[PDB]
Design a protein around this ligand. Structure first.
Ligand SMILES: [Mg+2]
Ligand SMILES: [Mg+2]
Ligand SMILES: [Mg+2]
Ligand SMILES: [Mg+2]
Length: 212
DNA sequence: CCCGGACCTGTGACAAATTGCCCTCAGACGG
DNA sequence: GCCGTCTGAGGGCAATTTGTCACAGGTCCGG
């Protein structure tokens, strides 16, 4: 009975770089906006702690540092670039934060759409594994299975992977294998994949999955 | 031919970053 | 009105994970 996140495919497939803590906050903003026109959201420390099973102290640390790391962050929809925030965050009351999302982002948030319950993702740690799990949901069938081929260059561009993952053996070891292992251990999805080649170069990854 | 060279793979090392933990002390509130 | 408790805003930590690069070791091309 946990919150059902839905988002436009354009966000699933946008180019940006966010941490886990920021992505966690981002799911609730999308939830708040959708339940309504101006872009102003709010986060309560004690509620965040209860959702993600943290203490109040570590929640406060997570929100505060996440919040100041949004500055200068930009989002690209393929292209068009936007800042996420147009005013610094601020706290009117103790245990409470108020934030100002770029109102021009509203239409990008909200029948080409992606949807998942928040409990599916709340134990994932690596933000790239959150990105991969969202793109797979975009292709999921009602029953819970799907199959899709993602191109390696597009993965690198959209998820803004760091430069050393342009060497394929590092791509495998520190991104692909790790995020496939997390999904299989931390979500209800059971995931497999295979590599597509052209000559000596590996060009796509083909993902298949079913539901537990 | 065999060479040096341009590709590809995986692993061992080390540097940089993130994780859940731990401790202090004042704010807000109610009994 | 004061004070005890529930909060959360600060300061830190060591153990793991993520990001980078050298080197070993495969193939095929062409002079
Ligand atoms: Mg933290
Ligand atoms: Mg080649
Ligand atoms: Mg040997
Ligand atoms: Mg050699």
């Amino acid at each position: 009975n946990s919150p059902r996140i839905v988002q436009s495919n354009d966000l699933t497939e946008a180019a940006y770089s966010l941490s886990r803590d920021q992505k966690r906050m981002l799911y609730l903003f999308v939830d708040q906006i959708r339940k309504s026109h101006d872009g102003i959201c709010e986060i309560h420390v004690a509620k965040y702690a209860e959702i993600f099973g943290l203490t109040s102290a570590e929640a406060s640390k997570d929100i505060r540092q996440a919040l100041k790391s949004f500055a200068g962050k930009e989002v690209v929809f393929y292209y068009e670039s936007f800042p996420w925030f147009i005013k610094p965050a601020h706290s009117p009351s103790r245990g409470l934060y108020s934030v100002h999302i770029n109102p021009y982002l509203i239409p990008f948030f909200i029948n080409r759409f992606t949807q998942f319950r928040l409990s599916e993702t709340k134990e994932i740690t690596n933000p790239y594994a959150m990105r991969l799990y969202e793109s797979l949901c975009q292709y999921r069938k009602p029953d819970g299975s799907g199959i899709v081929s993602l191109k390696i260059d597009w993965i690198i561009e959209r998820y803004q992977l760091p430069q050393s993952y342009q060497r394929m053996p590092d791509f495998r070891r520190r991104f692909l294998q790790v995020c496939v292992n997390e999904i299989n251990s931390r979500t209800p999805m059971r995931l497999s994949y295979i590599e597509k080649k052209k000559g000596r170069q590996t060009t796509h990854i083909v993902f298949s999955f079913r539901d537990i």
